[PDB]
Design a protein around this ligand. Structure first.
Ligand code: HEM
Ligand SMILES: CC1=CC[C@@H](C(C)(C)O)CC1
Length: 415
């Protein structure tokens, strides 16, 4: 169906479906064709709604800038097929959002709820976590060095530090690591009535757990995010638990896999470019540039969706009210109008105006926490390594949402 779809079926299938994202050489050439030939065009494949695919850096920014025109709330902000979206709606009392997180909201609601924590996530505030992050980073570096020159960088190291950081930011104690892992890896990881029961049950268990903290921080405040949210008010009243608990989940889930995935990306980049490892070791001031290149090149968030709320024009295309739009951050990050030799990992790349954290109204709340923890982590790691190389191929997550490296088998020499 839909006569406006011009993107060839094989191209559309590659960029929309999950499987392709397990392989850089499948996905990136498909987006390169789109950027060259059909930068912003409509695809319609079986099992999915018709959608515009924003492949250009300029277009992703322009759309992201305008939440009044391009909505997160009206449709699913996550790229589900029609079956899975139907399942989500039936579970969530009709609406296309599992929980009441920031990415489900439009202004002014979004502005209000984002505003509750926005200052806390700014660099000057985040800077106070440096000492705790340093300790956490060193612990992860240490458990890597406990291996005799061989391990999986993801499962044996990078899986842990970003979760512990996000736990420290929230105020979840170290001993709750198993539960938080269940949250991010099991529950939020990649019959019908039975699955619906397990879901409501699981989310209720996590919400009950989180409510314990909300209650605690109203009597015993701390400098963490739970305490900030528990004691926040709007119109002279506490924020409804559903918004608070969604905030805790959104922070933990958005903060863990993305950061681990990008760290893995860095290691892949450095293993394939040993000259750059030597560069980062000789000049540790380059590490923030290394961190930005890792995020650009890895681009662990593959897509978010928008719904057009009115008829409008982007790159001379007539986007109708109700039209769905896929924002491809990976494609924007390899846009040749912005980046020279985009497929190359290069830590000296400056400026590095990538869209790995998105752009506009919903731009990653955690970006400064992410950059700080990755910086600190690599500051601690790189001095301890003489060399690093891949021992086998990296395994990428087969997902069109939050993917990138899941396994990065490596060998290393200790400095
Ligand atoms: C390399 C690390 C990370 C990447 C690549 C990343 C990427 C993204 C992207 C693409 C978005 C959507 C932006 C948009 O729609 O314009 C986003 C949103 C968000 N991220 Fe991150 N993120 C990272 C780390 C973190 C961390 C560490 C946290 C929290 C501690 C976090 C919390 C969030 C939240 C709360 C949102 C939703 C903000 C909103 O809807 O207004 N992220 N992130
Ligand atoms: C990057 C990120 C991934 C998870 C999102 C969700 C679905 C928890 O709101 C929030 C933002």
């Amino acid at each position: 169906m839909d006569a406006r779809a011009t993107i060839p079926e094989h191209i559309a299938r590659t960029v929309i479906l999950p499987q392709g994202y397990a392989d850089d050489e499948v996905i990136y050439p498909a987006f390169k064709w789109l950027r060259d030939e059909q930068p912003l065009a409509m695809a319609h494949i079986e099992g999915y709604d018709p959608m515009w695919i924003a492949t250009k850096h300029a277009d992703v920014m322009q759309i992201g800038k305008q939440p009044g025109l391009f909505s997160n709330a009206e449709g699913s902000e996550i790229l589900y097929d029609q079956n899975n979206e139907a399942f989500m709606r039936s579970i969530s009392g009709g609406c296309p959002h599992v929980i009441d997180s920031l990415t489900s909201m439009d202004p002014p609601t979004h502005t209000a709820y984002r505003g509750l924590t926005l200052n806390w996530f700014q660099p000057a505030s985040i800077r106070k976590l440096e000492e705790n992050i340093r300790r956490i980073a060193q612990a992860s570096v240490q458990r890597l060095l406990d291996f005799d020159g061989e391990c999986d960088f993801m499962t044996d190291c990078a899986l842990y530090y970003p979760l512990h950081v996000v736990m420290t930011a929230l105020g979840v104690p170290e001993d709750d690591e198993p539960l938080m892992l269940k949250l991010t890896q099991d529950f939020a990881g990649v019959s019908a009535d039975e699955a619906a029961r397990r879901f409501h049950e699981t989310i209720a268990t996590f919400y009950d757990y989180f409510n314990g903290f909300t209650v605690d921080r109203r009597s015993c405040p701390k400098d963490d995010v739970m305490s900030l949210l528990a004691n926040s008010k709007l119109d002279g009243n506490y924020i409804d638990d559903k918004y608070i608990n969604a905030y805790y989940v959104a922070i933990a889930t958005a903060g863990h896999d993305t950061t681990s995935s990008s760290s893995g990306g860095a290691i892949i980049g450095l293993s394939r470019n040993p000259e750059q490892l030597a560069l980062a070791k000789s000049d540790p001031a380059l590490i923030p540039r290394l961190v930005d290149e890792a995020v650009r090149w890895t681009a662990p968030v593959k897509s978010f969706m928008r719904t057009a709320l009115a008829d409008t024009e982007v790159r001379g295309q007539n986007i109708k009210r109700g039209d769905r739009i896929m924002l491809s951050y990976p494609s924007a990050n390899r846009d040749e109008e912005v980046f020279s030799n985009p497929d190359e990992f290069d830590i000296t790349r400056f400026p590095n105006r990538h869209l790995g954290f998105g752009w506009g109204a919903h731009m990653c709340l955690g970006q400064h926490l992410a950059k700080l923890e990755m910086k600190i982590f690599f500051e601690e790691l790189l001095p301890k390594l003489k060399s690093v190389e891949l021992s086998g191929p990296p395994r990428l997550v087969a997902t069109n949402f939050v993917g990138g490296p899941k396994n990065v088998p490596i060998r290393f020499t200790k400095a």
